[PDB]
């Protein structure tokens, strides 16, 4: 299971 | 920019045995950026039918792919991997040596 969100850079 | 030229290996899945069936592998690794052209060659011309693994990359971020095809070796045919990449002036041809 992947993370719920990605990081905003 | 960072540019890394592909490392290339040509090898069979199993031991090479004339007459008998195997898979011809070309493993291309260590490259950046991701755009890359790979053909397998029988006696100097492209083998149709050729497949490959999903494009992935390693922990050091460089890309890799396995290109493969079922084949029967015969003494006196050249098998090869033809590779192009933005780091290469002309294509690289790496010949299948049964012993490597």
């Amino acid at each position: 299971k992947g993370p719920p969100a990605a990081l905003t850079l | 920019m960072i540019q890394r030229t592909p490392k290339i290996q040509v090898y069979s899945r199993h031991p090479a045995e004339n007459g008998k069936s195997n898979f011809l592998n070309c493993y291309v690794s260590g490259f950046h950026p991701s755009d890359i052209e790979v053909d397998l060659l029988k006696n100097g011309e492209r083998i149709e039918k050729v497949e490959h693994s999903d494009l992935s990359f390693s922990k050091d971020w460089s890309f890799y792919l396995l290109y493969y095809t079922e084949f029967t070796p015969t003494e006196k045919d050249e098998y090869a991997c033809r590779v192009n990449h933005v780091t290469l002036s002309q294509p690289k041809i790496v010949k299948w040596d049964r012993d490597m």
Partner: protein, 275 residues
């Protein structure tokens, strides 16, 4: 028998050829189990190992939902980073990402990870304490400060300490036969004479899983890496891996050399000699 789950991604801009391509993929150890590709013609997260196919529609719907969100976020990140470096709209760039957890024999969770690379270069990383960031340059410092101010570390740590660990355990049980095996290598030494002064000894390791292996040649034996040719460990195509280590020795001298092989599937590590 250490274990890890990793999610990776790559967003690759191609101006004047459409939206940036995005690919995402999950691994347990060296086995790919899931895959998303924006060029697929119907992008979604797809099975790549048989043991994940037993997950129901809610799992696939959420994995596909979250991954599409990530695609759009990393496309936005390409735009943002192009600006930070003041690069032209006409040029192509790569933003790569990695997230993962390592469990430890037991345990559990010796290590969480999360990193971004931009055009092959280290950009921003979550530190081992999972509470702080390391930025590779001044551009990345903007990203770092943004994560600090928005407190994002805590949210990453929660995924790493909770969800990543639990699902790794799930997958290791559901794919126990594929994932918790330790196929040892089939090993042999080949001999290649050169009349009549030397020969090449090649130590072969074949059909092994996982990838982590160590091959070393020794004489008497006191270990020479300098003259040894060691290929990169490579996929066989059937899930197992391959590797060899060659050394050129004087002729008549072959039984003074020995090849050492260490691998999880071994007993007891292996010692080889030519005949």
């Amino acid at each position: 028998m250490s274990h890890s789950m990793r999610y990776f991604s790559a967003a690759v801009s191609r101006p004047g050829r459409g939206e940036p391509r995005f690919i995402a993929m999950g691994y347990v150890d060296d086995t790919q189990f899931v895959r998303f590709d924006s060029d697929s013609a119907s992008p979604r997260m797809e099975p790549r190992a048989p043991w994940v196919e037993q997950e129901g529609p809610e799992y696939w719907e959420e994995e596909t939902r979250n991954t599409k969100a990530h695609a759009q976020t990393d496309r936005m990140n390409l735009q943002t980073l192009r600006g930070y470096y003041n690069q032209s709209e006409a040029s192509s760039h790569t933003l790569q990402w990695m997230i993962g957890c390592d469990l430890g024999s037991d345990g559990r969770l010796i290590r969480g990870y999360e990193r971004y690379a931009y055009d092959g270069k280290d950009y921003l990383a979550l530190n081992e304490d999972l509470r702080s960031w390391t930025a590779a340059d001044t551009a990345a410092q903007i990203s770092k400060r943004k994560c600090e101010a928005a407190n994002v570390a805590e949210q990453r740590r929660a995924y790493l300490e909770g969800t990543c660990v639990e699902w790794l355990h799930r997958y290791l049980e559901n794919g126990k036969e594929m994932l918790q095996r330790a196929d040892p290598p089939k090993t042999h030494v080949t001999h290649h004479p050169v009349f009549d002064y030397e020969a090449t000894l090649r130590c072969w390791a074949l059909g092994f899983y996982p990838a982590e292996i160590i091959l070393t040649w020794q004489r008497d034996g006191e270990d020479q890496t300098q003259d040894v040719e060691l290929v990169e460990t490579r996929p066989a195509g059937d899930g197992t891996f391959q590797k060899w280590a060659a050394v050129v020795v004087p002729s008549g001298e072959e039984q003074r050399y020995t090849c050492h092989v260490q691998h999880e599937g071994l007993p007891e590590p292996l010692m080889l000699r030519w005949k």
